[PDB]
Amino acid sequence: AMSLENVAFNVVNKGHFDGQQGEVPVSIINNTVYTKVDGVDVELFENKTTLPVNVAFELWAKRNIKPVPEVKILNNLGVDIAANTVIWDYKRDAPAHISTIGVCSMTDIAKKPTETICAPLTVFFDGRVDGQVDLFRNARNGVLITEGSVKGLQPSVGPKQASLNGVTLIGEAVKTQFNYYKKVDGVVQQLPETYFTQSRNLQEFKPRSQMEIDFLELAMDEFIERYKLEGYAFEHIVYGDFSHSQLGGLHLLIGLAKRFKESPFELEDFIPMDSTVKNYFITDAQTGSSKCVCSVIDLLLDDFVEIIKSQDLSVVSKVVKVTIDYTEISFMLWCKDGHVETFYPKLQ
Amino acid sequence: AMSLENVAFNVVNKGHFDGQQGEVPVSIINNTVYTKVDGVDVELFENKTTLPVNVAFELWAKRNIKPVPEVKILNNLGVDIAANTVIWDYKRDAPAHISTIGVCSMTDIAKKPTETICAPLTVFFDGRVDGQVDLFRNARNGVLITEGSVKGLQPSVGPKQASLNGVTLIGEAVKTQFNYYKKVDGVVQQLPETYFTQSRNLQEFKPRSQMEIDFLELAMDEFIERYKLEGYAFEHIVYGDFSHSQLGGLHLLIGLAKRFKESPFELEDFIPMDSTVKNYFITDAQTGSSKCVCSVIDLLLDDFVEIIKSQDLSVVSKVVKVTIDYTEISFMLWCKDGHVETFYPKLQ
Amino acid sequence: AMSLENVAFNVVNKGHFDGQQGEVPVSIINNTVYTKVDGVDVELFENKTTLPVNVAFELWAKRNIKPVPEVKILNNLGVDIAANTVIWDYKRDAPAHISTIGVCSMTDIAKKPTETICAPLTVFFDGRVDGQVDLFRNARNGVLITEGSVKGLQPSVGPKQASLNGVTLIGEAVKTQFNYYKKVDGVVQQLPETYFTQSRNLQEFKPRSQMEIDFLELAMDEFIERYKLEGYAFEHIVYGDFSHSQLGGLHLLIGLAKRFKESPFELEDFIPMDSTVKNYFITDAQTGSSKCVCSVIDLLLDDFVEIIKSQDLSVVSKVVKVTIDYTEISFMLWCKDGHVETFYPKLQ
Amino acid sequence: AMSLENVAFNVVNKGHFDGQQGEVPVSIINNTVYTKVDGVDVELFENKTTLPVNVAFELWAKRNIKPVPEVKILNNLGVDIAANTVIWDYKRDAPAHISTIGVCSMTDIAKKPTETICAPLTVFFDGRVDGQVDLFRNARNGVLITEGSVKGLQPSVGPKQASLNGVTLIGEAVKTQFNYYKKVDGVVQQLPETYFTQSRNLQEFKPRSQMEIDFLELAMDEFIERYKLEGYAFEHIVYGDFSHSQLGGLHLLIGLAKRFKESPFELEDFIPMDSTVKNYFITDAQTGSSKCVCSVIDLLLDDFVEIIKSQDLSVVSKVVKVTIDYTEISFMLWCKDGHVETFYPKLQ
Amino acid sequence: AMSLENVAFNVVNKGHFDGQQGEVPVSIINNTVYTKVDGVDVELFENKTTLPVNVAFELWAKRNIKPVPEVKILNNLGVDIAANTVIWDYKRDAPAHISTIGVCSMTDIAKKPTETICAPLTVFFDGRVDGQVDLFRNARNGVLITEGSVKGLQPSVGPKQASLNGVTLIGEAVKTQFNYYKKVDGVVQQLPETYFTQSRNLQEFKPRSQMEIDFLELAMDEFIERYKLEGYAFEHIVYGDFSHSQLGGLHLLIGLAKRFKESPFELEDFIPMDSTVKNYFITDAQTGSSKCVCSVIDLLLDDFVEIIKSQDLSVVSKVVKVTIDYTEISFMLWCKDGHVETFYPKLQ
């Protein structure tokens, strides 16, 4: 017996949908769900989605509360829908996928991912749930995550981090590093060798290597000297150039983190969604240097150094393609006299 | 197990709330309730009330579908709340009363009208439902309707008409004429002698007496001659004066009905609610004669004639009070040289 | 170059989307689209759909303005989507189908119905548009309408009427009677023998046979005598019984039309959508007789007489299935001593 | 002369409703109130309540701007309505009570708390306002606060802190510690002996005793040794266990504050309201340890130690009831072999 | 070809409107603009203005992204509209001006500021754009900013700071200090000699002189001794008096910044807009001292000291007028026995 009042009862008593029996009084006003608590209305949910308020409330209550892949990974792997769960996208305050399978009567296209309506969609399967590995084997298109070996299936070790209730973390009390598998048209696809983005924040950035510790603690010229980075334009690409009206370079998150500790700046997230490469309209508060579209990627500095040092520097300009988070990221590489001028995630 | 989906199931399958088990998918968008029917959304309800959309939907689904007293009668009798029913006010597209008793968890102040929260409120009791005559006996304040006699209690015969699903009618297949009883502080009141308004429409007006048939069929001067109405200003009060910029008189619905058959006119219902006296901003389309506040009452022409002929015509101006639909209606009576100049429901 | 301003320009200048170049200023406020005309805002569209206002505006502007099958026919034939058109559902003030093909970038699942996304969906094809008969030949699932014959394919003659801009009519200046073809999994189906509903209105009902003329002009007992209908409960089923609180029978639109000419009544369309059988909460204004769920079908009286006269009257109660508008309609048949007691479209 | 424009004038010129004469131009759009300031609209208020925008604006403008009891105290004391003031609930961005007395024409149930409509409600009275102590003496149900002695009335010394414009504080320039009194059915009730919650925040937590200073500065094992807390499960209850997928214990705010200084974590306030015990869906960012419903109380560590040390530890499981903020708080006490296993505010 | 989809394409690809060709799918729901990105809706803009959502979206996309005068300066100079640009007011999340010139078809009153509709309005002109100095010379009313000399026009050196994408800053990589010019009724007006407010924040306040460094680092009595400020009531005016229920003085931002480092407090910005003098409802969290209307100005402490030391202290009370940000600011000066009691920006 699925109902708005039962979903609300579960949120109030269990912190989320937990299949418990019960009902609480609910009032819906505009895009907000309230419940009566001792005569007064208490807000349970504000709809920030393009779905009807009561439908979005139910999908949010039915969100997966285990560590799940970050939405950028699912998107890069072509995931269209999840099997019998909701992957909540905390970057967008919305369900990661339009439709559901066995979750909500309003958004369900099927009750089971074995229904033929699901065959053309890449269904997300979670091996931690009974029967989901078998459902992936029977699925025409799909992405599977597991905590271990699936007999005969060649795995892809994914990122160390996962999203647990919107908190991206590397698990200590829980497992966040999964094996990934993908099928396209009934055929298991070999996932490519890839780098992974680190998913760090500007305000709580922590270094994850000796090189990263040295970047944050050492001065620009001594770091470049220590890591033999002369001629690789790190002064522009990583540290950033704030001397002209147009802000130069600044494409690695660690470079923004170093700058942030000294001088504040505004980052306008004009397409707010989870993605491997992020685009910001940046305004440096100290200098007034700005850039409408500043592409930023959070790679471990060692990974970025390996990528830039593995390029041929004899061409004026060329597209450099790098697999990051399972997707092909195009970078624009500009050279002059055998040295780098700039290297940035190519603005499509 | 009360729920939005269960209320919606009942509306879809039973035409209203009928206590049936079942659920249908629902979507709420702004003030509208939809249900999914074969992949597409179908509108079930548009909220025109000041209550939350899902709460108003439930009270409307739980509306009384038997002939009930017209809201103007309940209001005139001081009814605050109904016992275990919702009197739906079709003039306002809203519940007639703010709160409920044993109807909806969001609006309920009590489950049974015997709860002490109900003692100071005039509760409406319906003798057609088992135990309601007995609950009126135990209630401090209340109004009771019955189809037959109540032992020891003398009845007040109500109007012939009742509202059945928003259609005011005099029943032939159902009883619409009720016996009324009222208690104030545990004491059964003596309800006053009263006239009743006829609750007719302008577009489907039917005469209910030989005098009314004669008013509609005869010319003004011969009707006044036949019923000895000279000096009673019916030319102004009932027929209406459309010769000046300000529309004169026209306070009886039968007079508006007679005019409507010949020439159309606009009636702006600027306070849309059920009331004994209605106020309209009228604009006569043929002449351009108009009046911002034209008070209109639908009395049987014989009743209006009895009222006007029972007045002292020796005073220039005075307030004439008449019990109509159990309430005191003030009329302004203007006389000159022993004859009526005007007589209208006093705009206060 | 598709845009809101271009869609609005087409509506203002062409009465609908006509592929014309141009832009007009637009303002969107809540669910309404306005355009500036000489300094003031003029309403172009009010969104009554569950889609975003600008998306619904575009689909409505791009509606098919030729006579098209009534939505009840398309639904009964399992149509999921239309090829390169929008079938506007005027009963719901919304698009008949969730998604589009080659119509609007927000709702398109494909640009051409030959895309593999369309293969599992029953696509509606219109033989009056070039290449659509050929696209039906290549489609896995679909419904085709034509004005003439299709080589090798045997046709199913559809209803005489079609919907032209929301007006259901039998064409004189345009063709409204189509040949129907349907394919399921690449195989041209044999469409079943079917009756068709007449799609008439209560307020403008016209008889379409001598029997129907006789039903409307003759008295109940002489019509039943003339057409040898004794023992078939037409007094209850067709004419209606208004003598008890629950309105008896009244399931044929012609019976409601005959009643409507004499006495008015309220029909509450509680599931407002196009369907072969309609359900109304009816309240007879004259008697006060009412029914929460009164199923009404508009069959030609001759067709209804053929159906009822082709039934075995020896069973107390049974389900009678009749193909109407290509769908299986279940009727409940109740008999006693070899005569009909009642026969109604089964409320399920 | 109460008006929207006058309320807006007071907000603009006095910072709140101050009974001043004047009007400013106002525009209402959706749930926001604006005023024209030199040709442009400036936002004065955004309605986050379930009341109409103009009504909520007026109640917020008419909010009590003196230190008042925290809403959790008023709720625990059964307060239904306030006499001639609005207690604004800053946790909910809404009025603490549905109705008013002598405040706003839309929400007023009475002008004076002596009206019989108020007799069944527990009215809040403020002794700092002339005549309110006398109104409490005449009230059938009520809660009174005073800054001093009321002759013959036995007082209850309340918490040190009060809310002043949504800032909970212990007054230095103003008095925040009141005497509390309560009446139920005309009878003055003896308020129970109680502990009080400290109303601290996680981000600005300050210790209020030597034990609390020692908890925050000392390591877990030396604090437990110093205060003889061996066998009382403080490692689980207060410090928290982050080693398993389900976060263990962590029910005292001081324990969360200590953790917060070292590692950040997410606290989802899924029922956002003021209450003695708060429930959070917690996700520890460092470990990934989480709990859907983690009940947290802010007791002074000395008070919590007194409570836990005053319990019999010979039973496996039992409900321990403790008066906190005038209300009975149930705790679940789990013991094994004479030692505590867990002790938490019982999830109802 | 201006369109909603083209504006959205520019925002997605260029970070703002940049005149680029292209379209992206857009959905408008209530007051939010979304775009489809790989099947899911991503929020591009939330309308906080009183304009229609699509119109506000376009004006925000077309905002001036160069350093522009702060809105408080434009308002103080009487600016009504901008020539061929939108000055976005980040304090109000809205356009600084109601109408536009050559920007958006919905808000344009003209395409060029030379149109006679513009003659009575004070048009803002930007000398950094070709032809704008000439348009100011031809304009009847206007305000011009330049980065240099305009032949024959006497300049006014404006504030050092400008707003760049809502970040107020003193430019290093860009010029933020402009020359200002104003015309009223075809006549160039001499701008008055003025002080400028410093436009600092409470949370990131930095001193801009040795006196300001000394105010923040020295104790109250030694700063007053060092700068010979005895008898000038800085203890009240600048430092603030938190000893009584009504918070005394505290009218200089530097005084609030000094207090903020020690004890937190709530500043309610009840008229949220950019202005030379700001009014806050302040509540000191430590003491509970509060003031409904606390006028605060951010003057450099040296400028405030010069103003207060340039006043005659022999009158009990008088209005002191000071030009600040080109506007006349009235201050109330209260003296006793030749010493200052209080000096505050006069509450109108």
Ligand SMILES: CC(=O)Nc1cc(C)[nH]n1
């Ligand atoms: C006070 C009171 O007598 N109420 C009654 C009596 C009866 C017979 N019905 N209701």
Ligand SMILES: CC(=O)Nc1cc(C)[nH]n1
């Ligand atoms: C399967 C199939 O034969 N479809 C056809 C054939 C023709 C002549 N039209 N459509």
